[PDB]
Amino acid sequence: VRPEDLGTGLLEALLRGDLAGAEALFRRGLRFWGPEGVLEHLLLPVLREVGEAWHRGEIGVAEEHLASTFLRARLQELLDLAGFPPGPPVLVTTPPGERHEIGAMLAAYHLRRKGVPALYLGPDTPLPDLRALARRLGAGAVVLSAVLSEPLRALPDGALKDLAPRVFLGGQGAGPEEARRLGAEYMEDLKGLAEAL
């Protein structure tokens, strides 16, 4: 399989329920593109296409679920293989009501690859609870991934302002004006996140 066909190959393996084949195709991508590269060039395009195919009525919700669950497992595997250094953690989650978690996982992964102790909480964390954990662990930052815009629109002005000494917001659902309204620093690029600390 040529690299430019890995995405279709992987989606086709998943849609036939061939998890073993899908795992082999993902590892090929990992070896060809490298860790960050396989996420950019294989995991993300496949998930985007799964969303588009669902939207057009070509696949159902259970096919997306199968694929997303598989790809989340592949990223979790990579995350655990990255280093987890000592020192004040960075808490990584999604806003209340945001159930798309893979962006947050990606952010945690990019941070850990640069030696940052990113604690991935899972998605959908109430802000008082997030603030309390950050305070208790002496967390240097909180990072939020917003895939949809609506969970941010549901938050009052300044809702993110005091969660931790630094609060970063990114993802397709976020922009600079909404970050400003909510009292977070907007970050477009996962690359720029490690630098900013």
Next chain:
Amino acid sequence: DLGTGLLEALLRGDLAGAEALFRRGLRFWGPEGVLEHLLLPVLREVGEAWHRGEIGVAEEHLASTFLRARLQELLDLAGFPPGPPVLVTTPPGERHEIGAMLAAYHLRRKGVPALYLGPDTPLPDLRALARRLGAGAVVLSAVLSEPLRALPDGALKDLAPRVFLGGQGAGPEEARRLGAEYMEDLKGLAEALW
């Protein structure tokens, strides 16, 4: 006590310590054993501690997310046998997924190709995937009762030739109403296939 030590390591954000304690459990008890003796008691205690106001939601999230990662690793270690799959998920509105993962694990350990979908699958979509994969069975984990109560009579009937329902949120009467076979314990689930 490994369970208390694991929860304490998680609550300090000591992922390295937590992973070391989990691996000790795994080496001592083995795969099935670590679930029964460590993973499940910790999750139960996390729930109880949250309910009593002793821990917050972010602490439960960290612990649950960690343990889900460990169980996913055990799912991959059990392997995914060949042949017509058994689809495993949770009812629409059920966001507790670890029960479903557990069921998939126990089935895989008995050589059954349990394909874990993730949680919260609309029934028409689940039916369609079962049909497209020629799935011999569907298995649902219900942790809460409310998602089952929201479903129409007979809604689980014929998702596949065999449809199994278990978890704390399920009981025999609700399974009957919904057209599923009720399974009390994971032990009975593997048997009901083999």
Next chain:
Amino acid sequence: VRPEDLGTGLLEALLRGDLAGAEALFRRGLRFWGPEGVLEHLLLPVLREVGEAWHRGEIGVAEEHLASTFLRARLQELLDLAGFPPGPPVLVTTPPGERHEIGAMLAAYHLRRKGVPALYLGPDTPLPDLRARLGAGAVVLSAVLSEPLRALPDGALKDLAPRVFLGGQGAGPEEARRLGAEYMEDLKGLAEAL
């Protein structure tokens, strides 16, 4: 294959030239023991046994080569998957004359897993040329044989970088003292010491 049989399984796979089987068994070990664990419980015992079988005349050099080369590849894979943080590097190598490199790779791996920017140079680096300017906060050396250390004059390791660590089967506290390095018994204690 059960965890207790992974070591003999892996060695058997390697000795029959079954690299695909060997890779699968190594990954099983990785998933069961975790990254540091698979190195301690699978890579190291297999390599020890390879050495013992060679020394007793039971296997030839080509068989050891095959196994060592494979296991070095597996560790390099894990090393590249670990984070490589910014900041002043720690250079990792072996003394002049020391061609056993896997200990050094292990040291670099343990450091990277704790967020230390361990630059693995490969083995067998002339003490002068190791004067790599890059602002290295430390140098770490793995000694497998004792003879390459014995060949060095007193204090030969003293000022390679602000801190100089020495460990491995070929090193002890007295030899580290004579050469002017800090002795480290455990890979675990290496990251802490920084």
Next chain:
Amino acid sequence: DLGTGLLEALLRGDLAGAEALFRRGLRFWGPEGVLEHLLLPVLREVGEAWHRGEIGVAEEHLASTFLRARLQELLDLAGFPPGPPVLVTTPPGERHEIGAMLAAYHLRRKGVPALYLGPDTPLPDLRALARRLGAGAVVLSAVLSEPLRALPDGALKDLAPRVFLGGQGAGPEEARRLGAEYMEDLKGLAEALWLPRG
């Protein structure tokens, strides 16, 4: 010119930058292309720069170790097919291993189960392993000439049913003396093996 950028990143100890430049090369040139356009020219230049005293041994080590790791990844990506293996190594006393790895890589790309042993294998031990595994061939990379000169006439002839020799340290006359089939080009290796000796 990716080559100069890669070498400069490595000499700064910027592993992340070096890996990013290597991956760009992979995406532009593909697997065989990145070897020809990036890995090989960089190693050659590292050798020349050391020989002239421009870089030290630690710098060469850093670069060689990095590129060996990248090639090992490509070996695994090419896959290891089933069937009688081809053993790939270097002569006794030859510690340069990357040529052997290249040969294994080109064989695997053509579906040949090239089992890379690592470098520096005693001949009787190599012969014994080839015989025990029913290997169809042995392939040797000679970077230096001196390890070949040390060998007696015909030393390579019966290591396996077919024995191939190449690398900068080998030439046709030395291959003839040693009883190996000489190969210049890595691309021609799978072809040569698939056809009879003659």
